Every structure is written in structure tokens, then in C-alpha cells.
Design a protein around this ligand. Structure first.
Ligand code: FE
Ligand code: FE
Ligand code: FE
Ligand code: FE
Lengths: 356, 356, 356, 356
């Protein structure tokens, strides 16, 4: 269990960007800029800085050329400069390794703190950032599948209750989760900005980054991305969806970039800003909890996730999840799921829904 | 092979309605009227007459209470009264059993001819029909998943080339089909009204009715139907989709009514009215031919289909398809499919795409 | 009045393209290609050939450099080559001027007939046309405001009943019209292809081309066009809309190109292929007849229209309309229009709706 | 000028509900429930409590039967119960009239404070509220024009800079405003919850409530509202729109209820939660500032607004605006507005855009 520090927690505003190491910068560029239409804030032979349509801070994604594809940093912007200090004292009290550069680790970012948090994830906290032209009304640049905002991250970690508690102490509030009757927690969504989540914990071997998610204005914007991937003959890069999530109620799509980093295009979840926002708990066996329409969750979604780096550039060692696997308890040979609780009709046993 | 009659073929306008036998009228009513929102033109204890939002003829669907769920008639409206006679002479020349009632077989229809066509399907041809209020502008009745028109039928039959030829002689023109390099034809789409199809042939054991299809105005109308089925906890009744078809380029969804009759909600295919409309032929192994995004085609889609009746009310005997099964050659243990022709990467062998 | 020829009418399929004379090729290209995203089938220093997203014939619009902006030809495609011959004989029996070129009048068209019809409009009939790549599934090229097909033309002529009889004899069927309780007809819509219209007659001084119309897949594609024009600071070139039409029930938008040729973006009207399709007749004073939401019709919409050229390139003399003018009768000094028949609330006397 | 209290301001979360006095409960119910589809949380012969689709607090709108249609209270929810106490002390230090009821002023609300603020508006602060069923996934109840959340209020006050300072001291942050090259401010938008605004100040005679605003998921949901109103022959109750706002970039529509209270349907504005969110300032003469497409702003939109009641139920005296009026300065006899700064084309002198 992770202790609650005496030091006051920093006031986190929202997830702001992620820095991903990629192996071939040109292929990645083609995927992110040519296929997805993200806007370049800056680029050189080692990195590409990307921002979504409505963003004003410098970037929501940093592609960094490297030998091994992995997550290098997931960054949260804090409310004031002083919160960067509060973050430094907070993680030191927790005994975590931290590093601080008064002029940032990446272009366009100012004073920043990076840490190997208790779950082994490289987190960044910063306030100062370079403002860039906010393209929210540049309709002459609007593509049919325009990505408008960065919305959340999703982390794969072994013990969800352990991570939940630590993030709750950090100020994130849980909006939805998934449990079973034997007391096992499989996943939790937590927020800071007022949407369903800024980050989430998915139970599994970790530390690993499950995905980064961007949102679109409307559902047809997500449909366009699939259509365009079909036209480009890269539909094998569409991993799952599109669909309507049960948890978070958002319309979604998961695709894979050149190095297998998973990207989620998401839209239309609901407001959670009120402090007494009602928490929704879903049963792991409810076949409408992940996909509201009952579609099977592809197995690679549960098994495949990106590696993460420590502050030295090395890949973090992966810890095995000891609790029940969501995949095993639902689509494994000894798992089951239902459409209607207690109704054998429309339920599945040791088999995925829809005949697979 | 089916001979081309000397008698002139009737001028068929479009598919107009289908009469389906159902086992429990109240359950079926709940599905078609309460869930799907079709509009009642008339109903009594034995039948329910339904029409879509923009229809002016009496009905696009007739639910008839019966002991065995099956297709009783798929009806095409012809251009003039005289075409009903031309249809009578045409099928008699073909040696088919025909029946004709100067006042229709169902309410709201006038002089009509029903036949057991060369493929064993009960076809109806009629001109006269009762006009009803056209609801195209009754926005006060518009539901979020409004079905606006009846678009096509899809027939399951053993020998596609055999049926194609007969329908071509009847005046339908082929817009798209699916073949392989060994000369096997798996399916064909043919039209009369200017859209991709009024009917289609799907290779398999038959005669069987694969599905009836309705269209919506926009793609979000189709999304709403899935969402509503999730809210009602009947997502197990969603068989496949939604998706973008490769063939026909339409956005689609397949759902199952209480008796397993398959309904397709479809939208936005293209114009085919020009006589030299370019025909598109797809390779059976192209994984983007059915679902443009690469999603696996659920096996029940290929195996399950509705029974059809002869003119006496008996179920037609089913003939086995002798040619290669589309399911076997693509997702069977000895089948394969590709994303990019000639690229092993993104191809599937004895396994369905997406991990199933 | 215009006589019904003895010669059989040609079999018309649909409106196929319009040839417009523009004064500055570069500016027009900017509008039609960069702003609207139409696709270039061919271009040189004198002309630009554009086609919509789902078209397979050579083009839907020909921009020709000339000294006076005007309409040079509105082309309809006929069913067979012989129909061109039938069209020639038909117009000759009408005593109209004809001109035939077996090699066509513009690139991409073959044997074709151009005539100066009875209403003074330059109509072209043709069958042969060079097939080009149908871009209907090129989602990698799909813009957020993609124009997918050419839908109709709209002509301004002095006497509507007169032109109507002529076009009905030619095979066009009226779907909707606007009249007053005194028999004066203000406008008629007629089709060949099964949508509300291929062309329409708007009462006013003519001959003049009121507008050419393209359609999109969904309503949001039309919103994008408006949004993009705002971003490019050319919102003054948006004349009227977006709105919902009363007549035709389609979502619409009217914009002006560099020489003031009016272009309508249009979507989702209904099926009219059945020969007994019910005709709708709106009263001219009904304020929901043109814009279903009661938005006022801009004055220029009734007064400004494009000039038409005779076969020698001269501008056709304009004949004054003698019957009541729709503008005067509804939004003029002594105009009147209502929301509900007989209700004083929601009615407008001598002014437009909404306070203008 | 209004003094900045010494007492700490209460922590405001978002606008939560408006209590409107209506003269005929039955007619208003028809409008808000049957026409708009808002959900009834509770009702009796004197009041109707309505909530939007995704709300979990008791209600977003209270319709109260009374003799003079007016605004009785605009309520903001605060972070904690103690914030109510903080609000009371804050307003008392301002010398404003306060009234507190530990049992609340309307059903479903607990301890609450109502005050007659410095601008003469009846504001309510509260934390406790009865939780009800969050209908966010009840797709079986989702209408084609579903209102999903309450978004903002809009107040008409004489002096904008004055009210702005007061609200900034209260914790609101300005996101956008409209000014002229002469320092006169015409309107300001300010938020607490991270969207463009929770409330706004429109210059004009006040206090008056300009409108309450709800949002939808997508643009087509707003189109449906317009279409439905046309079907119900009440299009005269559509005041302005639909359009795209310049300020806020949201898709919008303004309708009038039975007593003429203005309701705005609104969607897709952007994120403003970061404390250094860039402020946008539009020039009053810029014709794309209110309607991005340059459509004219209806006169009544600037002159008509709802009355507000003091805490005793009397109508608040209305103070005349002394600064230039936005209407006069842009569409009046000596008004002026432009599409492009300095360009004579697309500019309007002494008249509205589009010819009115
Ligand atoms: Fe996610
Ligand atoms: Fe189909
Ligand atoms: Fe038109
Ligand atoms: Fe507003």
C-alpha cells in the first residue's frame, strides 16, 4: 500500500501530452500527420511535436526517435508554477526518483518535473508552456476525421486498488469501475478535468501504457477514420471498434501506430465535475460493459500494451498481475458473460459473444 | 440453365414489400413497432402492415401470424397494370406455377401475381396499391433511428450464375459481385431502381431469404438503433455491424427479429441508373470486400437464413450449394483473406481477422 | 403554347453536366477546386472539367473562359446513342435550332446534340462519354464538405405552365409546385431520375439559369462548407441558408461563385420513381414552403440569375414576366405570408419573416 | 463600481438551474416536455421540474405558475455546503439583500441562499440537491433532438465592464468579449466550469434574462428541433438560427417559449479550463462575430429579454443603457458591419447582411 504524503498534493488540471519513443520517424510521421491529420507545432530530425485542432498549449504528442518503442512520459499540466514544486516535494516524500529541469525536457515546455511514480510510470508535471495558434476555427484546415483534443491516458498495472488509492490521494476522483462479486477489481477510471477520465487503470502485467486517446466533435468523424484506413489499405491497423463503450458511454475506436502504440479516438462522454458525481460500478461479466452493443473485445486489446521507460531511458521491468484476468473470466474457456443478468439466453460460456 | 422467354419481361420498378410469417404477433409487433419504429398502416389479430417514413404505398412489410416463421412473398411493384399480365405470361412460359387474384393477396394491394420462380422463391408483382399518408415531413414523429425506405432483399441460392442470368433476362442489371480466380462466383447484386440493388444473390443452401433491408437518412441513425438495443438489453439480437460495406459502399447493420428473420439497416450507397454503370468485381479473399474496415463476418451470417414458402404454404425443400463456400474459403481452417493483395502482413489463414 | 411532337421523345436519364462561361479561370478554379473540393478530370488554359465524388462520367461541370459570364449549356444524358437521333428529330419537329457534332462540343463527350429549346435554353443531349475513375471509395480524398453528385438545374422562365407542358411532353414528371388560390403557378419541380427533380422552373424574367445543384452525403457536410467559407472570410458569398426546404424536404445551401453563378449544395430529398408518385402543391403565401423553418428568402435569390447563351455565343434576350412575382406577393410592400393559415400570429404583412 | 469583498468568494462549480415564472402551466408543459423532450423530475398543479438527459441533480429548470412571466432565480451549484455560508457572507459584505432557507426554495434543493445581486439579478447558491436517475444511457428514451445538459445563462445589463469586474471577483474568467476601437464593451462571456461560459453579459437595458441555454450531442440534433417545429406549424417561435457562432464557435439555435422566454440550443464550443486560456476579443463591426456565416442578427434578439423578479416577487426596475447599442451600431440606420476589414465588398451600411 502507498502512504498518503503529509506534503500537499499538486493541483493537477488535466492530461496534457505524452512523449512516445518511436523507431522510424518518417513512418510515424506519415501515420500521425498524413493519416490522422494532427498539426505540427515543430519538427526536426529527432522529434515531431503534434497538437490537436482546439489545443493552444505547444503540443499534445511528442514523437521521439529511439532504439526501442516505448512511452517516455505522460504529462499533466498543473494549475500554477508553485504546483510544480508541490509535486517535487510530494514525490520525494513518497520516496520516488525525480528529475527537474527549469527549462523543460522537451521543446515548448518550461520548468518541469519527471518522476518514476509508485507504479513505475514516468509522470511529468509542468505549468509553463509555449502558446501556439489555437486552430479551433481554422475550418479551412478541418479534415473529415479531425482530432480536436487530447482526452485521457490508460495505464496497465497489476493491482488496481493499489493504484486507485494512490491516484485518489493525488486528487483524481473515480467515476466508473469494473468489479466482480468475489471482490476483484479489474479497472478504474479517474478524472481531474470534468470528463469521465484523464487517466485509467487497466489490470494486467505492467507498468505498460495501454493507450492515449483523442477526441473528435462527432461520431461521423470517427467513422471517417475507419473509412480512410480502408481506402489506404491499412484496415489491419484497426484493432477494435468502432463502438459505443458501456463504461464512459463514449463512441470509440482503437487503432495501432507503426510501432504498435495504441491510439483511441473517442467522443461524447459526460460531465463529472460535481464532487458528488455518482460512481458507476459494472460487473465483469456484463457483456455490455466494454462494448454497449455486445461486440467481442479482441484478445490483443487485453494482452498487448506499450513498454514504458524509467528516467535513464531503460525499459521498466514488468510485474505479473496476480488477480483474475478480465480476459480469462469473460472470454477464456472458463469465463462467461451475459446480456441480461441471470438469463442463460444471450449469455456466452468459454466463448466470445457473436460466434467467435 | 434458365431459358430466356419469348414473352416480353414485365417492367419492374423496385422492391416494394415483403410478407413474413411470424409465430407470435405481439412479440413481433414489439420489435418492429416499439423497437424499430415502423409505422402501422393497418393491423388486426392476424396481421400487421408496416411502412417506412417516406413511403406512400400501403406498406413495406406485412407480418403474418403463422405456425412456421418463413418468407411468404417478396414483392416488386411494376410500372403499369399491363405489366402484371406480362408477368403472368412470362412465368407461365418459364413453366412456373402462378396464382393471380384481381384483388390482391394482402390488404392494400390490388391485382397481383404470385409465383414460385425458377429458384423456388415466392415472388409477387403488382401495380395497384392503396395510397396512405406519406410521412416524409412528419418530423413530430421522426425517431432518432428512423427507417425511411425499404431498399433491397437478399436471397440465398446454390448456383449464383444460374440465378444471375435469369434475373438479368428479367431486366435487373448487375452492379457488383464477388468471384475468385478459379472461376467461382459467390454473390451478385442487381438493381432496377438506380441504387446498388433491389435484390441480391448470396451463394449457399437455398431457397432461403437472407434479409430484408431498410435505410436511414444518416449514419448516426444506424448508431442509434444499436444504442437503443443496448439500453433495452437485447444487444444479443445485434448480429453484425455496424460497419461500412466494401461491396455497395453502404454503412450497415444486421439485427435479428423475434423469429430470427434478419433485418439490415443500410445507408448511403451510390447511383447506378446509367446503363453503362461500371461493374465492380471483388476477390473473395479481399478482407475488405464485406466489411471495408476488416472486421470479421460472424459465421452465422453465412449459415443462418430464413425459410421460404411455396404457394400452398409449405416450406420449400433446401438444395445444397455444391460450389466453394465463402465462409470456408475465407475464415475456414483452409481459407485465408488479405488486407493488401500479395502481402503476408495483415493476411489471415484458417483464422478470422482481428484475432478470432 | 408548345405543340406535342409526333416524333418519339428521347429517353432522358438525368441531368449530367453544366458548361458555364467564367471570366477568370484562375479565380473560378480557386472557388470550385480549393474551396469546394470538386475533382479535376482535365484542365488547360481555356477550360476546367470537374466531377463530383461518385461520378464516373467525364465531368459534371465545365468551366469555360469567356468574356461574359453565362450558361452555355445544360446537358442531360440519354439512355442510348439512338436517343440523340430521336432528340434531334424531336426538336426539329418543334422548329428549334439544332446543332450536332459527332465528336462532341467539349472534351470527354462524344456524339452530342445542342439545341436552343422553346424556352430559349441551351440544352444538350448525349450518350457517349469518357469513363474516368469513380472516386466513391477514395476516403483518402474525402473532404469534410465533399460534393458527391450533381442533382438538378433550376431555370428562370416567364411562364411556368407553358414550360411545364413542354417538359412533361419530354417525359419529365412534376413532383411539386407552388401556386396561389387564383391559378397562377409560381414554380414547378420535375424529374426523370427518381429524385424530386433534374430541373425546375422558377417564374421570373428569362431565360436565365437560376442555379446548378450538387448534393452531399449528410447535413453536417453542408455545415462544413459554411464553416470553411467563414474561415476564408468569404461568408458574403453565402447567399441563403443553410435551411430545410419545404418543397422537396431537402437540406440546402446557396452560395455564389466568382462570376455570381449560384450553386446550391443539397441533400436528402425523397424517392419519386413510381409513376403515380403523389404531387405536392404549396400555396405561395405559406411561409414554410421554401424554408421549412420560416427563415426569410433573400431578395437577390428572386432577382439575380445567370444569363444564357444562344448557340452562337450571344446572350439570349430576356423576356419580362407578366404574372405576379413571388417576391412581391410574399415579402414585398404589399406582400403577405403566414405560418398557420388564417392565424394572425406568425403572419407577416409587407415585410419578411423574423423582423426584416 | 463594485468593491472586491474581503470575505472569501464561494467556490462555484457551474450554472445548475433556472426557475422561470410562466403564466399557463399546461402550455409551457407542452413546449418543454412534448416539443423539447425535457424530462419531468416532479410536477403538480403549480410547478414542473425538468432535467436534461445527462443530469443527476434534481432539475435544470423549474417552471412556476405566476401572473407575470419573468425570471425568479438563476442557480449556481457550489463545491461544498460551507460555500453557501461563504456566499452569504460575501454578499452581505457587498450590502446585497440575502435570504436563506435551510430547507431550500424549491423541491429537490436543500440549504440554499438567494440574493439580489449588485446588477439586480436573483442568484441562488446551493450545494445539497436530491439525486435522481441519470438518464445518460437511456437510449430507449433518447429523442432525435435530445437536450443533454444545461450550459449557460445570458444576462442583459446596462454596463458590461462593471458587471464583468464583479463576476471576475466572484471567480468567473472571461473567455471572449466584443468591443469597438473606442473601448466600449458590448458583451462578455465568462466561465467557471471549463466551457466558454456559465453566464454572459449582453449590453442593453436591464436587469433582464436574455436566455437560458441547453446543449445537444451533435449538430443534427439541433436541426431536428427546427424540423419538428416546422412540422408542428410553430416555426414562428424559431427566433434566430440555426447558425455557427463566431464568439464561442458553438452551433446554435434560439427559440421562444409560450411566455417568450428565450431558449438557446447549443453545441460544441471548446475547452477553457486552463487558467491562462487565451482571451478572444471581437470588434463589434465584424459581421462574423455572432453568426460565423454572416447571417443577420434578428432585431428582437437585441431588444426583447425576460423580466427578473426581486426576492419579494416584484419585477425589477429596468435601467436604460447609455453606451452605444450593438443593434444601432451594426444594423441600424447608421450602422455598419464588414466581412473583411477595410474591404468595401461584403460590407453593409445602414442595413443588415443578405439584403434586409
Ligand atoms: Fe480509453
Ligand atoms: Fe444487404
Ligand atoms: Fe434547387
Ligand atoms: Fe448563449
Amino acid at each position: 500500500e502507498i502512504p498518503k504524503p503529509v506534503a500537499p498534493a499538486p493541483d493537477i488540471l488535466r492530461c496534457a501530452y505524452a512523449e512516445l519513443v518511436v523507431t522510424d520517424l518518417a513512418k510515424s510521421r506519415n501515420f500521425y500527420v498524413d493519416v490522422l491529420g494532427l498539426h505540427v507545432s515543430y519538427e526536426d530530425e529527432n522529434q515531431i511535436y503534434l497538437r490537436s485542432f482546439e489545443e493552444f498549449i505547444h503540443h499534445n504528442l511528442v514523437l521521439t526517435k529511439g532504439p526501442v518503442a516505448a512511452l517516455k512520459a505522460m504529462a499533466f499540466r498543473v494549475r500554477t508554477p508553485e504546483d510544480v514544486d508541490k509535486a517535487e516535494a510530494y514525490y520525494q516524500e513518497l520516496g520516488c526518483r525525480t528529475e527537474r529541469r527549469k527549462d523543460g525536457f522537451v521543446k515548448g515546455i518550461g520548468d518541469a518535473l519527471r518522476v518514476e511514480d509508485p507504479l513505475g510510470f514516468p509522470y511529468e508535471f509542468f505549468f509553463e508552456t509555449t502558446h501556439v495558434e489555437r486552430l479551433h476555427m481554422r475550418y479551412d484546415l478541418y479534415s473529415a476525421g479531425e482530432l480536436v483534443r487530447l482526452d485521457h491516458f490508460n495505464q496497465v498495472t497489476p493491482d488496481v486498488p493499489r493504484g486507485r488509492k494512490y491516484l485518489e490521494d493525488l486528487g483524481f476522483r473515480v467515476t466508473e469501475d469494473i468489479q466482480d462479486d468475489e471482490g476483484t477489481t479489474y479497472a478504474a477510471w479517474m478524472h481531474r478535468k470534468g470528463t469521465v477520465h484523464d487517466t485509467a487503470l487497466t489490470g494486467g502485467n505492467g507498468p505498460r501504457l495501454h493507450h492515449v486517446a483523442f477526441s473528435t466533435h462527432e461520431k461521423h468523424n470517427i467513422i471517417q477514420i475507419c473509412d480512410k484506413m480502408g481506402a489506404l489499405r491499412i484496415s489491419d491497423r484497426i484493432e477494435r471498434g468502432p463502438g459505443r463503450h458501456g463504461v464512459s458511454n463514449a463512441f470509440y475506436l482503437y487503432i495501432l501506430d507503426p510501432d504498435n502504440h495504441r491510439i483511441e479516438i473517442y467522443t461524447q462522454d459526460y460531465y463529472t465535475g460535481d464532487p458528488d458525481n455518482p460512481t458507476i460500478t459494472w460487473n465483469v461479466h456484463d457483456n455490455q460493459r466494454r462494448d454497449w452493443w455486445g461486440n467481442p473485445v479482441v484478445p490483443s486489446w487485453y494482452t498487448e500494451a506499450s513498454k514504458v521507460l524509467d528516467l535513464d531511458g531503460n525499459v521498466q521491468e514488468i510485474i505479473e498481475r496476480t488477480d483474475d484476468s478480465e480476459l480469462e473470466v469473460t472470454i477464456g474457456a472458463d469465463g462467461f458473460s451475459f446480456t441480461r443478468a441471470g438469463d442463460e439466453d444471450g449469455s456466452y460460456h468459454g466463448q466470445a459473444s457473436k460466434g467467435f
